[PDB]
Design a binder for this molecule. Sequence first.
Ligand SMILES: Cc1cccc(C(=O)N2c3cccc(O)c3NC3=C([C@@H]2c2ccc(OCc4ccccc4)cc2F)S(=O)(=O)CC(C)(C)C3)n1
Ligand SMILES: [Cl-]
Ligand SMILES: [Cl-]
Length: 560
Amino acid sequence: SMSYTWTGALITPCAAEESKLPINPLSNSLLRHHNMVYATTSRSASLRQKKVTFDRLQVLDDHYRDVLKEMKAKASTVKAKLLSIEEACKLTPPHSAKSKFGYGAKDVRNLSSRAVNHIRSVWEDLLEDTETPIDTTIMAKSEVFCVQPGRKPARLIVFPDLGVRVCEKMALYDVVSTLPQAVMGSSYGFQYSPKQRVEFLVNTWKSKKCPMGFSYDTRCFDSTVTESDIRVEESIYQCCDLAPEARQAIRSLTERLYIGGPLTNSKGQNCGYRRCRASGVLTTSCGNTLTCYLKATAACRAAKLQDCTMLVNGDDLVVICESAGTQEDAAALRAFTEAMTRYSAPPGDPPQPEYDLELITSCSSNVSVAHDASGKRVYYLTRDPTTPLARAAWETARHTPINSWLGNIIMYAPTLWARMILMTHFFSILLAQEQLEKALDCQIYGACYSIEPLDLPQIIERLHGLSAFTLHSYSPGEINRVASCLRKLGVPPLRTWRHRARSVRAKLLSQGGRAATCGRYLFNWAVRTKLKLTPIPAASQLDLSGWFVAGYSGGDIYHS
Ligand SMILES: Cc1cccc(C(=O)N2c3cccc(O)c3NC3=C([C@@H]2c2ccc(OCc4ccccc4)cc2F)S(=O)(=O)CC(C)(C)C3)n1
Ligand SMILES: [Cl-]
Ligand SMILES: [Cl-]
């Protein structure tokens, strides 16, 4: 079975597509080498099409079946609730793609009679019709990158209509929110906040007598997912206590949408047929996580890797285990990869065994070390800041509906680059435009949030602890990665950012209130005469439930 078949009709944009970074004074302050920054477009879709289109081999074995049964056992503890129309409508982003049937996300959120009646009929049809493939739209996603010699083609997104998406939520939101944790336990990555996640990686690393770790990068994971994989995934969902209508909906969604179906371009033309994972449905993150974990757990047994602890976030996979020795780890890792390959998860790049935790990257991120005010070692997550910086420059120049810079500040708050560059650059702008109190959209684990920049200090304390405001003596390797990133992108040197932050810090303090709290906490790094930083009372009061429960990337999820 081919992941995809194509009619020859093009993947088309539904509007004009910017690919170049404008020459704008505000963005130019952040990043001068504007021609290094680009956004993907429709024009590179045929290149992507070529990469995601292949035959799949899958041979299942007893290790695979053993693990599956174990997961199902855990799954059968779960009792999933059916979401009400109102509840599902509330989870729809304000700017989610309109329906082809004469209503949009706004109508969904407002529970208008048109949207709601169409949603009911979609739901009833799921219950009645078990076979008819549901239509999907295929689009080229616009994402911003820095050039590296040369360019990434656009990713392809495949999604059903708004009415169907609201119905997936009713049938499956509780399931995709609750079940991965029940099944994978501590290995489910999306349950951790940043501090918890770092805690778990470090503890796991320090628990082994001789640790070895690796990341495993499946070549085009969504395309490696077979119809059997998606039906096995359904077999796990079906172990939950379900309302009968949910049980039918899942069955019908599986056969009509999840396993595959027709692809239609922005212009309504038949583009082809998908027989693999759609990027843009509710079950993608859950399904990818389960499938990845299943295959990897069985492949570990096949490779005889000892005392494995997995961390899985969709298609992202980290394994930490007990070293058997350099040669034998290399052999065992190769056997793991052949097992994965047989299970239809071949590697992009061969995995490499690693004996230093900081050398392992999970979801762009690695563990690094710094010291807090008292000189105590603190572990934190960081990443190469090249893409975050390129995207922030873009978002400075162009109004984008989702702000990666804001998500990056939240998730990488303790980092040198987030603190000195991103906070300084954006607080300066917001402060000059008097927009500090204006809420902005970002994402956390794929789900969309509306966040007030003035609540960043409380947010950051909750997610990272107070040490996020006091870190210093960063590793030489972190410092260099950052420093040399700034040279490449024509981002001013850190000393410039210190100078700018002092000025911003002062303006923030002068304003008093929540603004001044941002000044004390966010920019204490910038002054020699430091304020003593105590817990923020409002931090404990934040309702961050739902933040670090599950992954929702591609799932059309909005949280208020
Ligand atoms: C299938 C798919 C495609 C693209 C992005 C994502 C995704 O949700 N994330 C992701 C995954 C891998 C790579 C990647 O770069 C990535 N990026 C982002 C996020 C998130 C995500 C980001 C980090 C992560 O784990 C490491 C981590 C965890 C907590 C704090 C810091 C790092 C897991 C995770 F799902 S985000 O939290 O939604 C917003 C942010 C601006 C941080 C971008 N998923
Ligand atoms: Cl990013
Ligand atoms: Cl200075």
